[PDB]
Design a protein around this nucleic acid. Structure first.
Lengths: 250, 1096, 365
DNA sequence: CTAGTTGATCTCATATCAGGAGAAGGAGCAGAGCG
């Protein structure tokens, strides 16, 4: 087995299948769990962000870390295309977990709320889509989720979209975003992602814009004075330093 | 930077903790004794204790408990150090090799925390599921064992009670259940908690909190049949098992508090209880069929004041004392007709709390000799410690004026010399010495009419006797003389010499060579020297053929220990010496390496040489002075090698250790002559004559520190030596109860004469203080002056003041009343000891406690409560103030060197004061602004000030190089682990500069001395190497152990070399040395470390 | 006492006894030393004092006039009487002086080379002690009522800042990131204090009568809200769980960090278990404060018994922490007392006050 | 029953001079108590 600080043992066979960077990832995710903070797995796509989550959750359940005796009920929000992909992935890389799909396709064939309750009681891994999160913020946000992974989490990049608010209604600190590109147009998107994972780190949205987005943007324009270039440089470095612990971008 | 070398002259002797168990083997019963830093392992034999291993911890052993985890064959040892190094030790013996492997270790010091008042508690679950440590207020550290650690990861449980007195794990509980007494404003209560290693928090205990006696200070977990706990308070002993509440108030335990206990049985039907008075009680649990019926306390007797006591077996109890000698007592079934069942079997020397000490060159030698105020209330005593060979005086016979001693095997078969010969003036008197019996019976062939310069056993199964007239070679078995030679002119032999094979005898200014042949004496060589012979030696050494090759000669008027080639009497070398004194003895011997010559003059000077077997040329001339009387040198062969003895006013054994010539002292008054003897009744013994009698004995030759004990039976406080009067003045203190009554006959109450202070100045149990004048030969209390009622004698100096010639005992006192926290009143009393009486020559009412007085350039420098003032001795013989100094919290310690005064404060730590005589006032020169609470202080150099803080640290301050020049710089830091009570210049012996001894509370005597920069660098390098090589018991780092440590500061050591660690460089095998000495050769460093060990 | 010296000398008692007991005895004897003075440099009241945690030699002092004075507390003169001379001073002419009242000032723990000071000009300025130039300036949108750097964090170097805003700002001095906010209070935060035991626990007290302890590492809001009654009056937490019945304008963890003392304008002090915020019900009686801003009070360290020294109007009231007994009230100021700081080496207390004086209280004899 | 298709139907994302009269406030200031 592989052992980390307090009680985290991930099975050795599982660990050996991983790469070195994926192992680093698993360690990073567990350090966050210790802090009770969230993070963004900003690995460039194709590196296999999902494999790292599988390993980490597997290790956490296996270690039976101490409300919850190891891994509680958890929800995975991922784009509609990849739900069965994630189901497949859990099934191969760790059969023991129950991975219920929440979708019209699904596998339940009853009312959905019964399925939500079932997973929240039997401590499964409820996969769902951003739509069903937007549409059942009421039902879903009544069950003490342990982990709230968002795959391709950039879809929460609009702080005012409904889906964003719904995703930010979840209460647990163990929020994770798996987003190959956690910033696509401007930093407002970044702030939004951080406000899901770590609600206070970057401040309020107005303050973030005032302090970071404006200066960092103005330093990119061709006509910007060198002074403003250097303010942008400063602010950019501050931002990287602020977000360093909580973003793992290989 | 300062370069200081600290070493242990006497390891700590105070037993701070002892446990029993099966540590070295499942069948052995071990007694593990923690003396402050030493762990001593014994085996509990049917008689006494057999030492097996003594290890040095890098820590003060705060906790020491044996526990046996499931499946383990034999007990593992848990030790917690004062710096909170935890370790679990196992004993692994592999044949001759013995190891203490560290099964686990760690550091459990919380970064922050109020260290608990009552002190570090360490308990172990009776089922070894956890080690509970109470280190800080409000927290309870748990070290799991079921989770088998190697790093001892421990977690705190928050304890809702912040003042915990004592705590124990209860027996017969499915969960680890602690029972502790804690103090809240509403009184003292006993509470229980269950420890959950899974939930890592407490739970409700089996039986709820109970309001107990006000002074409950002890919890005793009682084994499974009864369960429950027994809480000992001052006036009651109560038993709790949850519903049962037995309670007794035995009137006999009201007089003193019970401080230690031990479970005699495995089932807890009997406990020992030791009190601070030294009584020993037996607490009996009467079972009823099982529950507990009733409690009984019975007084077994008295012991030393026990810190810890352990019951070994068969009534043998080890009483481990911090205040007095530790004891091995027996508990008799029947009383001793004095009401006591305790009978002391053995006593282990304990230099107890060394509260003061002085170095006196008593016996007028060149050797210092510590006299220490050791021990406490009932165990107080003076210890005299010295370094010298010790021998037993078995066979004595008082024949005046011996002038000869030789071992003779009168039984020809045996190679033991069962006959002793002595020449007195003009005859020979022999001794049969048969067995241990001694009587004078005559062996044929030797004359009772002539002096004998020599006799002894020689080859061809022959004896030889050289007389003042002529030589006599006796055939041993058959009959008397068949060979005689005499001088042709019949001149008396003036100087002789002889060995087993040949003979060399001087006749005035000419010399004669004879050699022995069986039943014949053949003369060969002759010479005519310039002047008369003074001394000879012809001893064959490394002979390997049968005859010595060389000889040495000392001559008159040409003072020179010259060398001769034996077959020719010719001059091989002629080396002058100087002086008008004829050499009186000359010898050559081997010390492990080659032939040396030892020639001495009449005044104890003695020259050792490297003699060659081919040239026999004298070089490597170096001198040593030993005694004042003319000398004589005769060898005895030990187990190991030749060990030469010198006979004079100061008898000294001569020998070489690690190829280094040592000059040990022997602790006997005088020895005229010596001779080896190895009789059937006497093996390898000595035969030492004085002017009166023939003393006989044997020498251990271990060069151990010898410790005399003078029982005072009361707490000594100070001691000073008044040489002019031949006495020691000792401040003593005895406890009286009622007006008052002495609880026991103390040394003060048993003096020859006595007196009480009648002073016109000032007009349960109390402390009475006396000034004891003690004879410096017999150590009898010549006089005991009691001080005023409620007067505490604190300081005491012997000195002569001003210009008058009388040497005075000056005592500074304080008036102690319970109505106040700091004395407002006190006085400086001047005594003179003369004509066996102690007259009060002067007095001076001061307005505070006189904590310290040093005689300072003809003047008395006293330190009243916060003021340092200087007194002058006026022609009228009274003390008159000259100057004051007030910038002190409490001037507790005063030292002096020239015009400078070092003041150790209660908590401002040092102040360098100067008495500028031109003005007549003090000047604050420098000050150390760190808050160190001093325990003692010393002045090493003009600008180096040794200090000891009450946190067991040594620091050296240094006057730096503006107003930052008034800042002493702490250039030396070192954690001693001992509480220094006293420093004093001096040395216990005849590279390093200066020598400061110190005495500690645990009984350590250490030695600080100044090094040069080069040697300090070298020794620091080797210190790091040894740390890289030597492995400590609990895997503690030496640098961490010696790091300066305080509750509000922690810095690494610097400017101090652990002389213990360096001197450990000898006790490692050669490959390990090479590991040490990678980057000069090893033998260089062996020489270095030997020379370093030479200082103590 | 000579009993104490004799006990130390003979090993009857651990030397820890004599320190701690004597330390206590010294604390009980605190008396206004007229044999010690502090040089007057503030034109306005002293809001804050801070003795440096290592070596305790220097004190910083922040005034209502905006100046920061740096005093040397060692008696370098040979007399028994001395004035703690002022080494440096951020005076009216310094280019970087605060514009309005300095409200807090703090030595960087771990090193005397840098201190920090925050003001009503809405800035927290970090200063190089040696050159006495600002190394950094954090600007806040609201006036700063207090800040505090962790006495224990070898790892993080966050400054917690309480302003009139309802949010707690954490300012990272390592790359300067003043974005992180703890949100959950509702009115100005009048006092913040890091735990002396735990690296990342912060307690913050606010005018909404609530005190919250935070694990700033944690992304999930307060750990604990202190509740006066421990549950006797229990409500779904929207307005209940008030620590006090007024504003809570003071916090101080006890030395070992196991309890928290809060003072608020209901004229009470409470002692709270800092692990579960439970109320220990220590009484302490009536402690007058009506300060509208933070009240800076301390605890003793290294005594047999812990004491808390609280400004009580124009006096410093000394209380025993764990029993509540009022030891004494030290009476020597003329106007209200704003701050008292404890010198742990020698059991000396310095207290500033609105009358522009800093009085030293040193044990008598 | 089950995929497949097909509308709706939602969400989210993309970008730079010949007026006059009267009423209300404020400012300046004399002066009167008055503490």
């Amino acid at each position: 087995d592989a052992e980390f600080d307090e009680g985290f043992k991930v099975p050795g066979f599982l660990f050996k299948k991983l790469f070195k960077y994926q192992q680093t990832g698993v360690r990073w995710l567990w350090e966050l769990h210790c802090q009770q903070a969230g993070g963004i797995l900003g690995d460039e796509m194709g590196l296999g962000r999902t494999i790292q989550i599988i390993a980490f959750l597997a290790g956490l359940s296996y270690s039976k870390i101490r409300r919850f005796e190891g891994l509680g009920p958890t929800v995975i929000v991922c784009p509609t295309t990849v739900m069965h992909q994630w189901v497949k992935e859990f099934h191969t890389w760790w059969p023991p977990f129950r991975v219920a799909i929440l979708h019209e396709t699904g596998s339940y064939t009853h009312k959905k709320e019964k399925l939500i309750r079932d997973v929240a009681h039997c401590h499964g891994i409820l996969i769902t889509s951003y739509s069903y999160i937007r549409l059942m913020q009421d039902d879903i946000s009544r069950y003490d989720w342990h982990y709230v992974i968002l795959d391709e989490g950039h879809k929460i990049r609009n702080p005012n979209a409904a889906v964003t608010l719904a995703c930010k209604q979840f209460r647990t600190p163990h929020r994770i975003i798996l987003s190959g590109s956690p910033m696509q147009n401007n930093l407002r998107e970044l702030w939004s992602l951080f406000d899901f994972i770590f609600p206070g780190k970057l401040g309020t949205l107005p303050v973030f814009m005032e302090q970071f987005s404006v200066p960092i943007t103005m330093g990119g324009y061709s006509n910007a004075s060198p002074v403003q270039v250097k303010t942008a440089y400063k602010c950019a470095c501050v931002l990287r330093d602020t977000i360093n612990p909580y973003l793992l971008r290989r | 930077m300062s370069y200081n070398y600290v070493v242990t002259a006497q390891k700590p002797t105070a037993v701070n903790g002892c446990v029993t168990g099966h540590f070295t083997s499942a069948e052995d019963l071990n007694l593990l004794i923690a003396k402050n830093t030493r762990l001593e392992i014994y085996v509990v034999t049917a008689e006494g204790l057999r030492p097996v291993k003594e290890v040095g911890m890098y820590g003060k052993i705060a906790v020491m408990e044996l526990f046996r985890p499931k499946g383990e064959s034999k007990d593992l040892l848990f030790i917690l150090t004062a710096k909170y190094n935890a370790c679990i030790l196992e004993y692994k013996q592999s044949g001759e090799s013995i190891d203490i492997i560290t099964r686990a270790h760690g550091n459990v010091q919380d970064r922050i925390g109020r260290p608990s008042e009552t002190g570090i508690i360490g308990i172990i679950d009776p089922e070894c599921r956890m080690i509970g440590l109470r280190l800080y207020d409000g927290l309870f550290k748990v070290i799991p064992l079921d989770r088998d650690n190697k790093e001892l990861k421990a977690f705190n449980i928050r304890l809702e009670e912040l003042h915990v007195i004592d705590v124990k794990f209860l027996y017969g509980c499915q969960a680890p259940t602690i029972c502790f007494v804690y103090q809240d404003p509403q009184g003292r209560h006993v509470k229980t908690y269950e420890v959950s290693l899974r939930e890592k928090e407490f739970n409700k205990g089996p039986w709820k909190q109970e309001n107990v006696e006000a002074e409950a200070s002890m919890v005793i977990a009682v084994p499974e049949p009864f369960g429950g706990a027994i809480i000992i308070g001052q006036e009651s002993i109560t038993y709790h098992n949850g519903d049962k509440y037995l309670a007794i108030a035995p009137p006999i335990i009201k007089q003193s508090t019970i401080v230690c206990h031990n479970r005699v049985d495995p089932n807890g039907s009997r406990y020992l209880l030791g009190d601070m008075e030294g009584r020993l009680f037996m607490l009996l649990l009467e079972k009823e069929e099982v529950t507990l019926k009733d409690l009984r306390v019975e007084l077994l007797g008295e012991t030393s004041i026990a810190e810890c006591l352990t019951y070994l077996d068969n009534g043998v109890v080890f009483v481990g004392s911090r205040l007095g000698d530790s004891q091995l007592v027996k508990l008799n079934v029947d009383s001793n007709e004095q009401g006591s069942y305790v009978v002391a079997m053995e006593t282990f020397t304990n230099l107890g709390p060394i509260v003061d000490m002085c170095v006196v060159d008593l016996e007028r030698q060149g050797q210092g000799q510590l006299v220490t105020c050791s021990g406490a209330f009932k165990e107080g005593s003076l210890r005299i410690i010295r370094n010298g060979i010790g021998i037993h005086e078995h066979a004595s016979i008082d024949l005046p004026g011996i002038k000869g001693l030789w071992p003779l095997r009168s039984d020809p078969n045996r190679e033991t010399d069962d006959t002793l010969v002595l020449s007195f003036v003009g005859q020979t008197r022999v001794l049969m010495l048969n067995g241990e019996e001694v009587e004078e019976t005559e062996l044929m062939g030797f004359v009772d009419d002539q002096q004998t310069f020599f006799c002894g056993n020689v080859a061809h199964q022959q004896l030889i006797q050289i007389t003042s007239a002529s030589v006599r070679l006796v055939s041993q078995e058959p009959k008397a003389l068949v060979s005689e030679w005499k001088e042709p002119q019949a001149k008396n032999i003036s100087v002789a010499s002889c060995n087993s094979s040949q003979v060399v005898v001087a006749v005035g200014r000419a010399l004669y060579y004879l050699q022995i042949h069986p039943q014949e004496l053949r003369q060969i060589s002759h010479t005519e020297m310039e002047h008369e012979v003074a001394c000879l030696d012809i001893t064959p050494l490394g002979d390997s053929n049968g005859l010595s090759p060389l000889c040495a000669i000392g001559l008159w008027t040409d003072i020179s220990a010259r060398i001769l080639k034996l077959p020719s009497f010719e001059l091989l070398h002629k080396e002058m010496l100087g002086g008008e004194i004829i050499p009186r003895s000359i010898l050559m011997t081997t010390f492990e390496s080659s032939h040396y010559l030892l020639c001495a003059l009449g005044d104890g000077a003695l020259f050792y040489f490297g003699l060659n077997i081919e040239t026999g040329l004298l070089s490597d001339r170096k001198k040593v002075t030993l005694g004042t009387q003319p000398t004589v040198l005769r060898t005895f062969r030990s187990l190991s090698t030749t060990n030469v003895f010198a006979c004079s006013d100061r008898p000294t054994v001569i020998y070489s250790s690690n190829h280094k010539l040592v000059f040990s002292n022997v602790n006997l008054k005088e020895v005229n002559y010596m001779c080896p003897l190895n009789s059937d009744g006497y093996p390898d013994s000595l035969a030492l004559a004085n002017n009166s009698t023939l003393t006989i004995g044997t020498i251990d030759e271990i060069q151990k520190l010898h410790i005399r004990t003078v029982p005072l039976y009361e707490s000594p406080r100070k001691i000073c030596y008044q040489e002019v009067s031949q006495c020691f003045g000792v401040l003593s203190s005895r406890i009286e109860v009622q007006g008052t009554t002495a609880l026991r006959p103390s040394a003060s109450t048993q003096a020859l004469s006595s007196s009480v202070s009648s002073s016109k100045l000032f007009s349960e149990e109390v402390e009475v203080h006396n000034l004891l004048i003690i004879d410096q030969h017999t150590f009898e209390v010549l006089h005991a002056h009691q001080f005023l009622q409620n007067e505490y004698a604190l300081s005491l100096v012997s000195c002569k003041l001003g210009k008058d010639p009388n040497t005075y005992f000056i005592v500074g006192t304080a008036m102690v009343y319970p109505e106040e926290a700091e004395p407002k009143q006190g006085r400086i009393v001047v005594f003179q000891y003369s004509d066996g009486k102690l007259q009060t020559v002067a007095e001076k009412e001061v307005k505070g406690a006189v904590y310290s007085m040093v005689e300072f350039n003809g003047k008395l420098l006293a330190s009243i409560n916060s003021t340092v003032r200087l007194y002058e001795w006026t022609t009228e013989k009274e003390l008159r103030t000259e100057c004051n100094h007030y910038n002190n919290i409490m001037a507790l310690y005063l030292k002096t060197k020239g015009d400078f005064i070092l003041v150790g404060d209660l908590m401002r730590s040092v102040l360098l004061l100067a008495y500028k005589p031109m003005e007549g006032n003090f000047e604050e020169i420098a000050r150390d602004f760190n808050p160190n609470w001093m325990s003692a202080v010393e002045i090493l150099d003009d600008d180096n000030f040794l200090g000891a803080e009450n946190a067991f640290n040594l620091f050296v301050c240094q006057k730096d190089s503006d107003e930052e020049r008034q800042h002493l710089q702490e250039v030396g830091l070192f954690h001693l682990g001992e509480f220094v009570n006293v420093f004093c210049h001096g040395s216990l012996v005849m590279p390093t500069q200066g020598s400061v001894l110190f005495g500690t509370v645990n009984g350590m005597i250490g030695l600080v001395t100044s090094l040069s920069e080069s040697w300090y660098n070298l020794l620091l390098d080797m210190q790091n190497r040894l740390n890289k090589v030597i492995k400590s018991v609990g895997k503690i780092e030496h640098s961490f152990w010696r790091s300066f440590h305080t509750e509000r500061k922690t810095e690494p050591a610097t400017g101090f070399i652990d002389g213990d660690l360096i001197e450990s460089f000898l006790d490692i095998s050669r490959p390990k040395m090479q590991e040490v000495v990678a980057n000069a050769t090893a033998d260089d460093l062996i020489k270095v470390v030997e020379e370093l060990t030479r200082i103590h | 006492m000579l009993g104490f010296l004799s006990a130390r000398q003979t090993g009857l008692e651990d030397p820890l006894r004599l320190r701690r007991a004597e330390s206590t005895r010294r604390v009980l004897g605190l008396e206004l030393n007229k044999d010690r003075d502090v040089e007057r440099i503030h034109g306005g009241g002293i809001n804050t004092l801070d003795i440096e945690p290592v070596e305790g030699r220097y004190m910083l002092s922040g005034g209502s006039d905006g100046v920061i004075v740096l005093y040397d507390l060692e008696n370098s003169s040979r007399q028994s009487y001395y004035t703690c001379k002022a080494v440096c001073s951020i005076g009216r002419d310094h280019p970087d002086v605060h514009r309005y009242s300095v409200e807090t000032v703090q030595w960087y723990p771990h090193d005397t080379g840098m201190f920090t000071s925050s003001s009503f000009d809405k800035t927290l300025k970090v200063w190089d002690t040696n050159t006495l130039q600002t190394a950094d300036v954090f600007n806040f949108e609201e006036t700063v009522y207090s800040h505090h750097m962790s006495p224990v964090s070898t790892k993080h170097c966050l400054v917690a800042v309480g302003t009139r805003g309802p949010k707690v700002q954490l300012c990272d001095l390592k790359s300067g990131s003043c974005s992180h906010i703890l949100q959950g209070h509702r009115q100005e935060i009048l006092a913040v204090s890091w735990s002396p035991r735990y690296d990342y626990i912060l307690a913050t007290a606010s005018a909404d009568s609530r005190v919250k302890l935070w694990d700033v590492r944690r992304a999930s809001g307060c750990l604990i809200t202190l509740d006066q009654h421990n549950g006797k009056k229990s409500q779904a937490v929207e307005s209940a769980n008030t620590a006090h019945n007024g504003k809570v304008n003071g916090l101080c963890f006890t030395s070992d960090g196991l309890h928290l003392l809060t003072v608020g304008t209901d004229n009470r002090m409470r002692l709270w278990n800092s692990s579960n915020g439970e109320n220990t019900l220590v009484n302490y009686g009536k402690v007058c404060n009506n300060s509208k801003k933070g009240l800076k009070f301390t605890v003793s360290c290294g005594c047999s018994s812990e004491f808390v020294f609280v400004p009580y109007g124009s006096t410093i009231a000394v209380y025993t922490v764990y029993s509540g007994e009022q030891i004494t009230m030290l009476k020597g100021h003329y106007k209200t007392v704003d701050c008292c700081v404890f010198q742990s080496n020698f059991q000396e207390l310095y207290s500033g006050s609105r009358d522009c004086n800093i009085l030293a209280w040193v044990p008598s004899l």
